[PDB]
Write a protein that binds this ligand. Structure first.
Ligand SMILES: CCCCCC/C=C/CCCCCCCCCC(=O)O
Length: 133
């Protein structure tokens, strides 16, 4: 049941995103621009196929996936990963695997805000998105 996540969301807070990017090996110039970027995330469904768009003035991505079915993904920072997205404890959990590394991108709804928690290595980044009408 992912319906409450659907819609258009805009970034309104970010904590520790530089640490997360640095942990992934993102270069300093990309981190600089990324630290000042406010993406718009659009989450749509057609049956159990979700499409998650992330749009910004810097990088854009789009993925489509069936919940619970692995898919290939090429991330905004150009990692080629094996991914799966599932609903777990009411949270939309996106796991990426590559070269034996793992990162999770976890989305949950708290007081009407979408909280995205990004974990890689020890780095834990929390980004907050609010719904656009
Ligand atoms: C498409 C926009 C990507 C996030 C902002 C620009 C950063 C680019 C390089 C680092 C990418 C790291 C993995 C993706 C993080 C997504 C964050 C988010 O959706 O808020």
């Amino acid at each position: 049941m992912v319906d409450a996540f659907l819609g258009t969301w805009k970034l309104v807070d970010s904590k520790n995103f530089d640490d997360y990017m640095k942990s992934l090996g993102v270069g300093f110039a990309t981190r600089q621009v990324a630290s000042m970027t406010k993406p718009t995330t659009i989450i749509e469904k057609n049956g159990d196929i979700l499409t998650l768009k992330t749009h910004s003035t810097f990088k854009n991505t789009e993925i489509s996936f069936k919940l619970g079915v692995e898919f290939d993904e090429t991330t905004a920072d150009d990692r080629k990963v094996k991914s799966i997205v599932t609903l777990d404890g009411g949270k939309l959990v996106h796991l990426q695997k590559w070269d034996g590394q793992e990162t999770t991108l976890v989305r949950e709804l708290i007081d009407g805000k979408l909280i995205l928690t990004l974990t890689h290595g020890t780095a834990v980044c929390t980004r907050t998105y609010e719904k656009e009408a």
